Ligand binder design. Structure first.
Ligand code: HEM
Ligand code: HEM
Ligand code: HEM
Ligand code: HEM
Lengths: 146, 141, 141, 146
């Protein structure tokens, strides 16, 4: 993956405004609601019975904070996403057997959350730069399948 | 399959676009062209730059097709049959691309209608656009 | 959408499986487990090794579901509704996996019925299995 | 991509029996018939109006021979598929803008052709080894998108 300096500026300027305690739970909760087969992997999280139950589930919020911290790490290392995600790739591929299409889906749910939270500031060129980011994260996370 | 709540959710959310329908369709197309450059090759006869009158006009057509699908949500194969023939037979659009435009339509709605774009409505809108996409890719031959 | 020729082609090809129906369903499952190991995690209660009585028995069930879809090709959503509920609601099967089993069913038919597996019949069978898959993934909620 | 020595033996023993003048046209022709949007890229090939016209089109056969020669090259370099496919990746991604899902589809059509031609010899373990091969070729061909 390929971001220009102007895309990197776009991406990191917005990211500095992201609430890192909330946005990852919002994205993970929306993954579980919008793509409900993903709930198969979160049986121990308890109540996932309704959208409100998912979004208010403290385990979803806490786990989403971890997910978002990995995206932050990728943002900080856009030129070595593979190394950055190696152990997470071993976990998600070799151990959990998550189909890698779901990595693409979670990245795109995050893009939707950023659109929702930033509104007009989430311009088409800003989105295009974030699509490069979430594609690169998904591809790096899927490396153990390749 | 769309539930009764999904149909309510989609109508209600789409209802809030009002006179901006064409504008949001045009924005979603621009988002698609910029984010997924492989999609540009289907429009060699258009300039895809910002403020393009051709993208503005096409966005109104895309929005009109989406409103047709909302209005005839229980009979979508029939409502979109001509458009399904066009995209598969004449235009040969790769089925992958419907996922890309659908995502960009979700992004556009989220960027303009934050009160409407709750997790439940997001899910309903995704299912709706996936159903539109299923119809529009149903005619390959 | 399946054309009249696609329906004829699928019935005719499937017709040649005869008493081997269960065996070919079992083989397709084995092909899937070996080629796409992520799919194994849905069957922790089965041994997936060659000659497994559990895979043999499940292959008969899968074949019976496919014969139901062939026999009721014009009403497939209804025919497969219970199975669609099972795969989405109870089993939470990832939609990607239907593409993988569909490919393995095509491979199995090709390996056993070379005279039937012409390019036109291949296309009809792919469309048929994609339609089965669309029904089986239509009930997520 | 990861093939064991026993998979490599399986794969290369079968490949030595493949008719290299015919199997690539059979796979490309079946791609165009089974996934007909792919015809968008072959307008200059002339008559693609029916399955018989596609399969008997000499340009499909000739082009398919080229495609198969690239697979043969990948078979000969399973440990450096990326280098092997670099120029073809630039062509198919940067120049032709082919969606990379279609690389997966063509690999799987080739698997179906091998099943058809080898019958019982195309055992489940032999297929599994060829799936690793066609996945690795598709991923290498898609490298310019990553
Ligand atoms: C872009 C995509 C994703 C990122 C960056 C991501 C990130 C992570 C992180 C940072 C962890 C915690 C690891 C720890 O405790 O060291 C985790 C755990 C896990 N993830 Fe993800 N994930 C992704 C996608 C997904 C998907 C799509 C699923 C399933 C649908 C999933 C399922 C899991 C599960 C079940 C665990 C818990 C593992 C355990 O504690 O044993 N992840 N993920
Ligand atoms: C939500 C999905 C989509 C909707 C509702 C939609 C809608 C429409 C509409 C209403 C037309 C005009 C039809 C005419 O003038 O009868 C059209 C044309 C067309 N669409 Fe789409 N479309 C969709 C997705 C796609 C995708 C994914 C692509 C390609 C990436 C695409 C490429 C085209 C092209 C190339 C034309 C013709 C443009 C003209 O040649 O000038 N469409 N679409
Ligand atoms: C052509 C596509 C498919 C067909 C026709 C099909 C058919 C069936 C049938 C008939 C049953 C038995 C239903 C019962 O006993 O009511 C079943 C069960 C089930 N299927 Fe499928 N299936 C398909 C694809 C998949 C896929 C892709 C997977 C996962 C990779 C899957 C996983 C399962 C599981 C885990 C069970 C339950 C096994 C039992 O818990 O013992 N199916 N399927
Ligand atoms: C695994 C996948 C594939 C392999 C290995 C492959 C291999 C090749 C080869 C070896 C060439 C000839 C390059 C030359 O003349 O130097 C070629 C040309 C081309 N391929 Fe593919 N291909 C693949 C998939 C596809 C797909 C899926 C499409 C479109 C649906 C496609 C479209 C083209 C076109 C249109 C050309 C002609 C380019 C030109 O001469 O300007 N290819 N491909």
């Amino acid at each position: 993956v390929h971001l220009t300096p102007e895309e990197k500026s776009a991406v990191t300027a917005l990211w500095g405004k992201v609430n890192v305690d909330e946005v990852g739970g919002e994205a993970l909760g929306r993954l579980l609601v919008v793509y409900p087969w993903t709930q198969r992997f979160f049986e121990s999280f308890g109540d996932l019975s309704t959208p409100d139950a998912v979004m208010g589930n403290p385990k979803v919020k806490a786990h989403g904070k971890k997910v978002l911290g990995a995206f932050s790490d990728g943002l900080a290392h856009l030129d070595n996403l593979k190394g950055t995600f190696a152990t997470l790739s071993e976990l998600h591929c070799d151990k959990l057997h998550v189909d890698p299409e779901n990595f693409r889906l979670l990245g795109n749910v995050l893009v939707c959350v950023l659109a929702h939270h930033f509104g007009k500031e989430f311009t088409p060129p800003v989105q295009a730069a974030y699509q490069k980011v979430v594609a690169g994260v998904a591809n790096a996370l899927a490396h153990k399948y390749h | 399959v769309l539930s009764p709540a999904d149909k309510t959710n989609v109508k209600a959310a789409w209802g809030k676009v009002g006179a901006h329908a064409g504008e949001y369709g045009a924005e979603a197309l621009e988002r698609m062209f910029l984010s997924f450059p492989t999609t540009k090759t289907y429009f060699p006869h258009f300039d895809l730059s910002h403020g393009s009158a051709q993208v503005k006009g096409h966005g109104k057509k895309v929005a009109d097709a989406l409103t047709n699908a909302v209005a005839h949500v229980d009979d979508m194969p029939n409502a979109l049959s001509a458009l399904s023939d066009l995209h598969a037979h004449k235009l040969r659009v790769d089925p992958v691309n419907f996922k890309l435009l659908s995502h960009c339509l979700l992004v556009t709605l989220a960027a303009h209608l934050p009160a409407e774009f709750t997790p439940a409505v997001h899910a309903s809108l995704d299912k709706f656009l996936a159903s539109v996409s299923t119809v529009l890719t149903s005619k390959y031959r």
